[PDB]
Every structure is written in structure tokens, then in C-alpha cells.
Amino acid sequence: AYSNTYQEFTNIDQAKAWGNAQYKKYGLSKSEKEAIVSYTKSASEINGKLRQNKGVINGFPSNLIKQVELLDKSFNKMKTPENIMLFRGDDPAYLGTEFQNTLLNSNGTINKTAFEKAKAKFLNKDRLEYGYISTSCMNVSQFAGRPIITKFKVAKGSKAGYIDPISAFAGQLEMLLPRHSTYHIDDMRLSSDGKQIIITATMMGTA
């Protein structure tokens, strides 16, 4: 094959370390660090308004339009040295309103019929996310209960920032990604468990 290598953090301290060493070289304004901190205590509220009005902020309250602009700005400084793999956790409503109450049997195991409906609906296709993408350097335990697990592959030089410390209200080994990002679902298979779906997306960029 003609496949490229991505660094996957196999240990928490190794991630925490590489992580903090990237926080240094960013040099974020005081203004942004509070936009990122407010973003971690409101990630739900903001991304919701972002997926909604499909990227338009010229209707958002003043407070917001500014924060949104500040978050975007911050990414001019937060890129990644080399190719990396990030981990995200999602609930069924992520795949669609139809998988909401169809994806998992009351046994907790994944329904192989709904799984195929999804595999056909997304495999080898590009998805577009309107809000920001919170992720982790590893499959931390704040996912693991979540039925869907995406594994992003981010290319050298792409916007990605280790905001773990910048906000105390940032998840474990948290790594933010720019809004409006577009990735390509390259693989879907069930965990060697029975309950999950292990997606393998390939990021491309943000427009």
C-alpha cells in the first residue's frame, strides 16, 4: 500500500508531555484563552448554533460572534508538527435521527441491521461538520461508554490545538479542531466486543 504513518499516543504521560510542549510555542492572546475557556463551558451551546444556521454568525448575539471569531483566530497559531491520530466519542444521534432509537438493542449490543444501514450511508463518503470538533489524544474513559468511536487522522500542518490546560473545563488530553472541517469516512467496523462502531475518518481541512 501507499499509506502514510500517524502518531498514536500509547500512554497518557507521553500525550500530556507532547501536549504541553505544544502549548508553549502557541502564544495565545489573553483574549482567546477566555474564548477557549468559555468554549469548554459552552461547547454544547455553541456547536448547536453552528450546525444549525449552517456556519452563519451574522445573527448570533454580539458576545458570540466575537468568541466565534476569536476561536477561529486562535487556529492560526495551533497547528500540528506531524501527522497525528485523534479520538472522539459520539452518541447514536450522531449517525442520524433514524439511528437514535435503532442502533442499540436494550442488551447494549449493536444491532447488525442498523449497523449496515449506517455503513452504507457513510462509508467511503465525505462528511462536513459545521461546529468545532472536540477530541482526545487517546481513548480516554470519558468516551468508552459511548456507542460510536471515531478515529481522526490529521495531516502535518493542520489546525489542531492541545487546549487541555488552557481550559480547566477542557476534557482529558483534549484537542480542538476548526469549525467547518471536512473528513472522509474510510472505514467502519464493530469493536471486537459487540458494542461499538469503530470509525476511521481522514481529515482534509477546513474551508
State the binding site for NAD(+): 40, 47, 51, 88-91, 127-129, 143-146, 172-174
Nearer to Hg ion, 17 or 65 (CB): 17
Please tell me whether residue 68 binds Hg ion under the rule CB under 5 A. no
Please tell me whether residue 138 binds Hg ion under the rule CB under 5 A. no
Length of the chain: 207
Dihedral angle sign, alpha carbons of residues 164, 168, 171, 176: negative
Residues 140 and 173 sit within 8 Å (Cβ to Cβ): yes
Please tell me whether residue 166 binds Hg ion under the rule CB under 5 A. no
134 carries an active-site annotation: yes
Please identify which residue in 50, 103, 104, 137 interacts with Hg ion, judged by CB under 5 A. Answer: 137
Q: Which residues touch 148 (CB under 8 Å, ≥6 apart)?
A: 89, 90, 91, 92, 94, 95, 196, 197, 199
189 carries an active-site annotation: no
Stretch that binds Hg ion, among 21-29, 51-59, 130-138, 150-158 (CB under 5 A): 130-138
Of the candidates 38, 74, 158, 174, the residue annotated as catalytic is 174
What is the C-alpha separation between 200 and 112, in angstroms, rounded?
18
Give φ, ψ of 111 to 5 degrees.
-75, 110
Catalytically annotated residues: 88, 134, 174
List residues binding Hg ion (CB under 5 A): 137
